[PDB]
Each structure stands twice: as C-alpha cells, then as structure tokens.
From Swiss-Prot, chain B:
Residues 1-40 are annotated as: Necessary for dimerization and homooligomerization. The lineage of its organism: Eukaryota, Metazoa, Chordata, Craniata, Vertebrata. ATP-dependent DNA helicase that unwinds single- and double-stranded DNA in a 3'-5' direction. Participates in DNA replication and repair. Involved in 5'-end resection of DNA during double-strand break (DSB) repair. Negatively regulates sister chromatid exchange (SCE). Stimulates DNA 4-way junction branch migration and DNA Holliday junction dissolution. Binds DNA. Binds single-stranded DNA (ssDNA), forked duplex DNA and DNA Holliday junction. Belongs to the helicase family. RecQ subfamily. This is RecQ-like DNA helicase BLM. The N-terminal region mediates dimerization and homooligomerization. Both the helicase ATP-binding domain and the helicase C-terminal domain form intramolecular interactions with the HRDC domain in a ATP-dependent manner. The HRDC domain is required for single-stranded DNA (ssDNA) and DNA Holliday junction binding. Monomer. Homodimer (via N-terminus). Homotetramer (via N-terminus); dimer of dimers. Homohexamer (via N-terminus). Self-association negatively regulates DNA unwinding amplitude and rate. Oligomer complexes dissociate into monomer in presence of ATP.
Amino acid sequence: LHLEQQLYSVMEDICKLVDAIP
Amino acid sequence: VMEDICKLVDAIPLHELTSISCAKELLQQRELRRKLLADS
C-alpha cells in the first residue's frame, strides 16, 4: 500500500503552502 | 486530521485563485491529491 504513504506527504505540501503568510 | 483544511483548498474557485502567488505549483497538489484518492 504505497499509495497511503504517498498521500501522507503530498497533501502536506498543500498545508505548508497555506502557512506562507506569516 | 489536518486535511479538513485541504477540504477547503479544493474549494477555492478558479477566479479567486489568481490572487495568491503560490498557486502555480500549489494547485497541482489539488489535482494530484484527487487522482490518488481515486485509486481505491
């Protein structure tokens, strides 16, 4: 199940992106 | 989890998405988190 680990850190790049108005 | 946030990021309209400069690359995170969810 290499697809769950791939979604664990690919929608974690969308979040850190949300962080960049600090 | 943390992605009830990203639930709100797949919802920003395409007209309202041009006002942020990170969107060139952080909208391919939207269209890729949707092909991977679809691989059930």
